[PDB]
Every structure is written in C-alpha cells, then in structure tokens.
Design a protein around this nucleic acid. Structure first.
Ligand SMILES: *[C@H]1O[C@H](CO)[C@H](O)[C@H](O)[C@H]1NC(C)=O
Ligand SMILES: [Mg+2]
Ligand SMILES: [Mg+2]
Ligand SMILES: [Mg+2]
Ligand SMILES: [Mg+2]
Ligand SMILES: [Mg+2]
Ligand SMILES: [Mg+2]
Ligand SMILES: [Mg+2]
Ligand SMILES: [Mg+2]
Ligand SMILES: [Mg+2]
Ligand SMILES: [Mg+2]
Ligand SMILES: [Mg+2]
Ligand SMILES: [Mg+2]
Ligand SMILES: [Mg+2]
Ligand SMILES: [Mg+2]
Ligand SMILES: [Mg+2]
Ligand SMILES: [Mg+2]
Ligand SMILES: [Mg+2]
Ligand SMILES: [Mg+2]
Ligand SMILES: [Mg+2]
Ligand SMILES: [Mg+2]
Ligand SMILES: [Mg+2]
Ligand SMILES: [Mg+2]
Ligand SMILES: [Mg+2]
Ligand SMILES: [Mg+2]
Ligand SMILES: [Mg+2]
Ligand SMILES: [Mg+2]
Ligand SMILES: [Mg+2]
Ligand SMILES: [Mg+2]
Ligand SMILES: [Mg+2]
Ligand SMILES: [Mg+2]
Ligand SMILES: [Mg+2]
Ligand SMILES: [Mg+2]
Ligand SMILES: [Mg+2]
Ligand SMILES: [Mg+2]
Ligand SMILES: [Mg+2]
Ligand SMILES: [Mg+2]
Ligand SMILES: [Mg+2]
Ligand SMILES: [Mg+2]
Ligand SMILES: [Mg+2]
Ligand SMILES: [Mg+2]
Lengths: 201, 144, 117, 19, 64
RNA sequence: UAGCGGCGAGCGAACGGGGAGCAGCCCAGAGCCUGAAUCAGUGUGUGUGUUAGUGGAAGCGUCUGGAAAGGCGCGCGAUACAGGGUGACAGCCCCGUACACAAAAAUGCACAUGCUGUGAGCUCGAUGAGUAGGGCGGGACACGUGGUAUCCUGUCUGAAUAUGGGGGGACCAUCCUCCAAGGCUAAAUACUCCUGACUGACCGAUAGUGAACCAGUACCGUGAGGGAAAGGCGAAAAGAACCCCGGCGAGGGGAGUGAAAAAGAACCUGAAACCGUGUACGUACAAGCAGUGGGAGCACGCUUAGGCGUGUGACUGCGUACCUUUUGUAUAAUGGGUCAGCGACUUAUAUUCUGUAGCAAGGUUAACCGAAUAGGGGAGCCGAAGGGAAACCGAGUCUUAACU
C-alpha cells in the first residue's frame, strides 16, 4: 500500500497493518472516551452532614412537641443541611490497554487515508516565525482547519501556528486519538510517517 | 469519522439501576428491597457465613492440615518453558532470568505439559517419568 | 452537575392542572387534589367506555319493546321472529327505525309474526 | 416553615390513666 | 479496601480442580468408642461441599 | 498470604523484589606535625530572583436597532484569537495579551574573595555496667502467654567486657553474621492559618462558606456556647421640573426622562397557592369522593347557512379520595391545610457474574521515569495441572499391605 504526495508528486511506502486495516468504531470509541475522561480535573466537593458548620445539638426533644423528630440541624432533609451523598474530588482517568490504544490509532489513521483527510508532504516549514506566512501557505495548499505532524518540532512553525485556532502543530510522539479525528485534515511530513509506523508497528 | 459520529458497540453500555424514581421504572418505593426486616434497612444485612444463629458451616466442620513453607519455595515447570530460556541449559537461575519461576523458588520440577521439540540440558531439577521420556526423546540430557 | 427541578416540575403540575379544568374547588387549583381527580376521571372513563355499550343497547331494547308492543307483539317474541325470518338488522338500527320510520318497523313486525305463525 | 417548638408548659388537665 | 478472608473458613475448606471445595467430615474428633468402625471409616476421607452450602463458602473465601 | 484470634467478631506481618532519594561522621585521648580539610557568623564584589513599573500590532463603509461589538461588503495585525470591559456577540474602541525592557533603596538564593572562630592528616592506644542477662508485674512487637523468640521497664537482682559479647522466633550444638549499654547528620516524606498566578463535564442566592449584603453581625443564653434572614432599576440617574386631588400627609393622576416607567427605587423576569373586578352559562323541591357515560337548553365564534369548534351543564346510568400498612381499609387505622423550592440506593476500593472491546496460551503492567493521556518500566498479578494434611508424586494423585 503506497501513499502519494502533492508537493513533490512521489510515492511513500507504509505498512498495510497501520494504514490499510478496517475501522473498529467500538475500539476507537472506548479510546476517544478514555482520552476525554483523562482530560477531566475532577476538582469539586460538597459538605456531608458531618462537614456543614453547626452544633450536634438535637434541635428539640424527641417526643411531645408535635413536630417531626429532628436529630441534627445538618440533616440533608433540612434547608442549609448536608448533601446526602456529598461529592469528593475524583480521578476520572480510565486504563487503556497499550494494544487497544495502538489499535485505535491504527484504525483512525487508516480512516484518515480512505476519507482522503491525511495529506503526505516531503517537507513542511516557513521562512520566519510569522503567522501571515503559514496562513498564506495554508490558503495555497487549500485547507483551513488542519493538524500538522513534523519530525523535529521547528520553533518557527510552532510560533507561526500558535495564534491560528483552527491550526495545530505537534511531533509524531505527540499525536493523540481525539486530535486525529477533531481536525478536518492531517498534514504529516515524510519523516513523521517513518516515526509513526516505528511507534505503532 | 467525527467526534459526533462515534457510537459504542451494541450492548457495551447498559443503563445502571436507579431505585426509588416512581412506579413506571419498576424499582419504585421499596427499590427492590421488599417490605421491612433487616435486609430492607440502610446498612442492613447479616455478615458472611451467618445462618441465623445455627452453628455456621465454617465452624461445625473441623479444621485440618498445616501450611508447608517448602511448598511456597517449590515450583512446577511445564515443557513449553524449556524453549523460553536463553542459552539451552535449564539451570535454577536461567528459569529466573526468563521469568518462568519466582525469585524465592529454591526447588523446581519439570512435568509433562506442552510439547518440547529442541535439545535441552536440564540441570539441578527434579523431572517426572513423562518429562525424562519427552526431553531425552527430543534429544535432551538430564543430571542431578 | 447540579440539576434544578423548577422548569420540569412546573410543566408536569400544569399538565395535570389543565386536565382538571371544570372540577370543583381544590380539584381544579391544587395539584395534590387535581392529580387524584384526573386519575379517577381516567378510571371512570375506562370503565364507562364499556358501560356506554351496555347503556345504549339497554336504551335500544327499551324502544324496540315499546314500538313492537304498539304493533301488538313483545320484544322477546319480536327478536325471535326476526331470527326465524333470518333478519340480521341490529338493535341500534331497529331502535332508530322504530322512532323515524314507524311504517318500516310495522313491516319488520309483520315479517316477525309471519316467521312465528 | 414552622417555628422552633416550645419547651414543656403547664398543663390544665391530667392525662386520663387507663389501666 | 481488599476483601478479608474469613480465616476460620480458610482453615476448613480447600478449593478443588473444578472449583468445588473439599472439607473434613464432622463427628470424628472424640466420642469414638461408641461409634461403629464402619461409620468412622466413612468419616475419614474428605468430602465435597454441597450445592446449598457453596454460596456460603464462596462468600467466606473470595481469594480461594 | 504467614500468622494471631471467646481460632469468634475481627486483627494482620515479614523475608524478598521494583522504585523515589542517597552521605556519611564525631566523642569516650595522648603525642608528633601544625592550624593545612570543612561546615558557621562576618563584611565586600559578581551575576541571577523578589518588593514599584515601561513600550506593546492591526477597521472602515453600509443595514437593523435606543445603542452595534450583530447582518452584509471590502481590508488589516497575529511570537498578541488568554481574559476582562465598552449602550446586543469586538483579534484591529479600551484595559490587556505575546514579546521586549526596568530598580535609587531594601532583601532572598547561588558563586567569588578577605577577616574571625572551628580544627584536618599520620602513628599508637582506647572501645559506653547498676548495663546485657535473669526473677516478679505490666506494656510493645500482626503475634491475646501460647511451645514464644525479640523490644521497653515499675520492682528485686546482676555478668563477660574482644582469649569477650548480641542475634539468627522455645531450647541445645554447629556455622554464619553483627558489636548494645555515648552522640550528630542533608535528600526522597507530612502539612497550608497565609501570598501570587492559573485551572475546573464544581455551586449560582433554600445552591455555594454560617456569611455574595457592614456575619460570627442581628438575635438567643448567667455562661461555655448557639446563631439567622437579607443579592439584581437603567446603557447612563437621565432617580420623575412643573401642575392637580390630599392633612404644606400617605397614596395617586397628569407632565417630563428613557428603547421600555405594566424598568419609579415596596424597582429584571415575575410562576403557584391565595384574594378580587368584569362577562357567559348554571344554580333557591334538592341528598353523598363531586367525577364519568349519556344529554337538553343557552351564549359565543366560524371557513357550507350549515354543520362543526369553544364555554356552560338542566336531567339521567354508574360511582365510598390518595398514601401507608395489612389476611383484609370508604374505613371511624397511619400521613398530608395549600403552593413553590429542597428532600432518600451514593462514593472509594476489593471481589464475583453478565455484556462488550482488545490481545490470546498467553493476557496485563504497579510505583516510578517521561513536559509527554505517548513511550519506557513486566517488580508483580492471573492463566496454561492436578492430587495429597504434608514430604512428595505428577496427567495423574491420594487412600491402603494392595486395590477388582
Ligand atoms: C398537666 O399534665 C402534666 C403531664 O404532662 C402533669 O400531669 C400535670 O400535673 C398536669 N396538670 C394538671 C393541672 O392536671
Ligand atoms: Mg450547604
Ligand atoms: Mg503507560
Ligand atoms: Mg414489581
Ligand atoms: Mg414501608
Ligand atoms: Mg413482614
Ligand atoms: Mg425481606
Ligand atoms: Mg443509619
Ligand atoms: Mg518475575
Ligand atoms: Mg447549574
Ligand atoms: Mg386556575
Ligand atoms: Mg412545608
Ligand atoms: Mg483426633
Ligand atoms: Mg495595544
Ligand atoms: Mg456594521
Ligand atoms: Mg440587552
Ligand atoms: Mg560497644
Ligand atoms: Mg532487662
Ligand atoms: Mg527472657
Ligand atoms: Mg537482648
Ligand atoms: Mg536467641
Ligand atoms: Mg533458629
Ligand atoms: Mg446561603
Ligand atoms: Mg432567584
Ligand atoms: Mg447578652
Ligand atoms: Mg407625591
Ligand atoms: Mg437587562
Ligand atoms: Mg418586577
Ligand atoms: Mg397570578
Ligand atoms: Mg329549581
Ligand atoms: Mg316535594
Ligand atoms: Mg347536600
Ligand atoms: Mg350512585
Ligand atoms: Mg389487623
Ligand atoms: Mg371496600
Ligand atoms: Mg371501619
Ligand atoms: Mg382516614
Ligand atoms: Mg368521616
Ligand atoms: Mg402504626
Ligand atoms: Mg393529620
Ligand atoms: Mg499444583
């Protein structure tokens, strides 16, 4: 299975097991959901009846008053009372099997090929760290929303794509499943494809 | 393939029980606990093995046996693990190098489990009447 | 993720209050009382879709009995007559013709007597 | 809502004793 | 936290190959003279835990 | 897990392995040589932080509107599209932001260099006694006195002190290993009253702190102590000149302001219970869960001049609320005056079963490393073999002298 380039008009060889396997939606879903869950901060709490500020004094005597029996002004039944099942800070992170993560990326990268969303180029850089230069290069290569993976994280290209919200620039080791789906197009350098293959196998 | 076109596999995500949310749900009111008694109560239920006061099974039956400390430092080696070792010679350190038995194991035994089909030198290991007949057959050697 | 119940709770109570329009006192104003009244209105409605079929047949038979006796025959014998004459015109239509076409009913009664005699 | 209930106050009549 | 084994149960039940549990018979501790040899002989070998009892045993021995 | 355990309820190691971090020294002493290593103050220079700050890009026309940041058109900046504000939603209006700069003065840290104290190195010697150990009583060790090692000591005792002594889980021998009865020592670890920045599938005024508000206040209590309620006019006060009724009132009606005053300060929205005014229909010979099925008449509105839609409902069939609890409730058993808001199967970690996904005789890593949701890390865990109390044997094994 041979990928084709647009800038140089050449052929780049790739593994059939990495860029030419069927889309395992169920597997990709689990990894995407796991990634979103990994992004959660999980920083919150409410006060149980134990934590709400006030005395343990029984508001009124058990019997004789003619009112519902009360034990604590902190009862969750009461206004200003505890939350019955007060939240604690949680870790929402999920375990993703190494093989289930790699198999998910393989499924995603394979879809990007068939949907013609993966563009392969020999070299992708700009002259100086100027957003105007990259912006111009993207309205020449004919894409607005795009994810750029490059071999060495060139400082100029990184800075030049920082103020463009629809454009993101990363290395081959910094690819994530969500970013390979979220972005309309993915523009990978020749070196990147020779780093991704070796990382997935 | 978009973030709003990904579905989980059919039946992979079953909706959890929500007790005490009305008649329609079928878990209304009592929330599947029934009427009254210890088991309907918050934190209600008897401990494991409790039979209602009747001398429980793990008490009316006698204790037996003792735990062997020697058993804990004795391991069994199958035949398929004789190929996994790096060298060809199956000593009581090469089995630890290749992670077949534990670091604390002082006694190992080769038994008839799997098919060994390579010449193997088993040294300082007890070997079964089927193992000595399977290793030697493939072209192996044994010494105490 | 805290959920306020106000908007949904309001919608549910209003839906019941709307079905309780025309009911007396608390039954058209007070949710607790209106809910019971709408359920009971429903129970009766379900019961009376069956009773309606009983009450209307009861009414048809009463009228056929009347218009047959004016022609000089009981209901019991008139229907027996029609069945022997192989007349399959149902009581709803008999009752309707007994009121609106007394000449046609007399014709049915004549066929009744003929089947008996 | 409801106000905090009163502590016991003098009672006019003894509860009848049934025994 | 980890479930705790009912240690008394662990001293009286061993898990077999197919998942059942072997146990020692009761009535062979003392008062042996009045008991027939046949009865005592049949009480010597280990027996399997019955179907009705398995649930109770498995609860007590989560790491069996 | 091994153990401990009215062997109950429960309690619960260690060895060893993987990591973070890593550092060793001094006195119990005399002499030689000299103050030579190094930690501490002490000023003095050097950088680099902190405590004020400085500069900081780029937009106009038109349409709707009270107002434009919105729509539409055509431009421009971007190492700056973090965020906030501005009469509705602004990269280019404002404050910022990226980025680049800044200290008279004080102070932190890290190097450099004088001063003061401190004493290295080498040779020879020394090697912590009411102590170890013991008896009695307790306590601590996962270990409840048990067969119970080991540690601590209230009480009574009491060694050997290197040719010696401690430990190796009763105890003895052998062997191995260590040197008590003197002391010092960074890092990895714990915590946040408090300070700055930043973040949230955290709350949004009965929530979130008790407290968004002059709240630990009002108020309660002799006192310790307890402890509320209460947020929002508008873009801008432009917060209503003046006139009129009224008590030189309250309150209101005009006028004027505003996009809006049914935004008028008792102010965004303005639900429900609850209370009224108006209109239509019913209702003063009529018995009960108040509805429901049938149904006349009247009023109103229509898109056949006609049926149909709406409101009412004479008369009539049927008909004893709801919840709870019960063998069974119209029950004269329980609970609810009504409305609105809140109010009850959760969370963590283990374990088992089901579904689903991956991989498959393999599967998977934990801590941790890594800026890395990657990658590394396979320490471990589960499985591929069982039988036996166990030694042990092993597709068998146990039982038994041996099994048909
Ligand atoms: C009132 O009742 C109380 C009990 O609650 C005492 O019995 C008291 O004595 C009573 N007083 C009278 C006057 O009967
Ligand atoms: Mg609260
Ligand atoms: Mg990992
Ligand atoms: Mg049910
Ligand atoms: Mg109940
Ligand atoms: Mg009961
Ligand atoms: Mg029950
Ligand atoms: Mg409780
Ligand atoms: Mg290992
Ligand atoms: Mg909310
Ligand atoms: Mg109403
Ligand atoms: Mg109330
Ligand atoms: Mg015995
Ligand atoms: Mg500026
Ligand atoms: Mg405009
Ligand atoms: Mg507005
Ligand atoms: Mg010493
Ligand atoms: Mg002592
Ligand atoms: Mg002793
Ligand atoms: Mg000692
Ligand atoms: Mg000893
Ligand atoms: Mg020993
Ligand atoms: Mg509050
Ligand atoms: Mg509000
Ligand atoms: Mg006071
Ligand atoms: Mg006035
Ligand atoms: Mg507003
Ligand atoms: Mg208002
Ligand atoms: Mg109202
Ligand atoms: Mg009348
Ligand atoms: Mg009368
Ligand atoms: Mg009456
Ligand atoms: Mg009736
Ligand atoms: Mg009863
Ligand atoms: Mg009844
Ligand atoms: Mg009764
Ligand atoms: Mg009642
Ligand atoms: Mg009554
Ligand atoms: Mg009761
Ligand atoms: Mg009551
Ligand atoms: Mg085994």
């Amino acid at each position: 299975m041979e990928l084709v380039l647009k800038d140089a008009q050449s052929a780049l060889t790739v593994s059939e097991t990495t860029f030419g396997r069927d889309f395992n939606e169920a597997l990709v879903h689990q990894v995407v959901v796991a990634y979103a869950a990994g992004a959660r901060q999980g920083t919150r709490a409410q006060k149980t009846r134990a934590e709400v500020t006030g005395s343990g004094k029984k508001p009124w005597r058990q019997k004789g008053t003619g009112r519902a029996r009360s034990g604590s002004i902190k009862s969750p039944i009461w206004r200003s009372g505890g939350v019955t099942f007060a939240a604690r800070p949680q870790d929402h992170s999920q375990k993703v099997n190494k093989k289930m993560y790699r198999g998910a990326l393989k499924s995603i990268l394979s879809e990007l090929v068939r949907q013609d969303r993966l563009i392969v180029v020999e070299k992708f850089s700009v002259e100086a760290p100027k957003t105007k230069l990259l912006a111009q290069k993207l309205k020449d290569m004919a894409l607005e929303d795009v994810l750029i993976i490059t071999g060495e994280l060139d400082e100029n290209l990184f800075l030049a794509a920082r103020n463009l919200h629809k454009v993101d620039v990363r290395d081959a080791t910094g690819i994530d499943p969500v970013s390979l789906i979220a972005f309309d197009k993915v523009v990978m350098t020749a070196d990147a494809v020779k780093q991704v293959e070796e990382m997935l196998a | 393939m978009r973030l709003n076109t990904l579905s989980p596999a059919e039946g992979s995500k079953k909706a959890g029980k929500r007790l005490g949310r009305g008649i329609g749900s079928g878990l209304g009111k009592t929330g599947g606990r029934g009427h009254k008694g210890q088991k309907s109560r918050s934190g209600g239920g008897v401990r494991r093995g409790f039979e209602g006061g009747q001398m429980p099974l793990y008490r009316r039956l006698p204790k037996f046996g003792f735990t062997s400390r020697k058993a804990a430092i004795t391991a069994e080696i199958r035949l398929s693990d004789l190929a996994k070792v790096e060298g060809g010679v199956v000593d009581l350190n090469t089995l630890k190098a290749a992670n077949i038995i534990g670091i604390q194991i002082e006694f190992a035994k080769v038994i008839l489990a799997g098919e060994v089909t390579t010449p193997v030198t088993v040294r300082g290991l007890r070997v079964t009447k089927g193992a000595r007949a399977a290793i030697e057959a493939a072209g192996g050697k044994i010494e105490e | 993720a805290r959920v306020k119940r106000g908007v949904i709770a309001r919608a549910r109570h209003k839906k019941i209050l709307k079905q309780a329009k025309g009911y007396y006192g608390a039954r058209s104003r007070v949710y607790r009382v209106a809910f019971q009244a709408v359920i009971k209105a429903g129970q009766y409605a379900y019961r009376d879709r069956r009773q309606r079929k009983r009450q209307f047949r009861q009414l048809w038979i009463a009228r056929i009995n009347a218009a047959a006796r004016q022609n000089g025959i009981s209901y019991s014998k008139f229907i027996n007559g029609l069945k022997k004459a192989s007349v399959e015109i149902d009581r709803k239509i008999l009752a309707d013709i007994a009121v609106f076409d007394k000449v046609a009913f007399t014709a049915l009664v004549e066929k009744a007597k003929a089947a008996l005699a | 809502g409801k106000p905090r209930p009163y502590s016991p106050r003098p009672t006019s009549h003894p509860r009848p004793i049934r025994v | 936290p980890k479930i705790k084994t009912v240690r008394g149960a662990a001293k009286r039940f061993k898990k077999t190959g197919k998942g059942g549990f072997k146990h020692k018979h009761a009535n062979l501790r003392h008062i042996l003279t009045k008991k027939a040899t046949k009865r005592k002989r049949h009480l010597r070998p280990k027996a399997m835990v019955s179907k009705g009892d398995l649930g109770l045993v498995i609860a007590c021995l989560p790491y069996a």
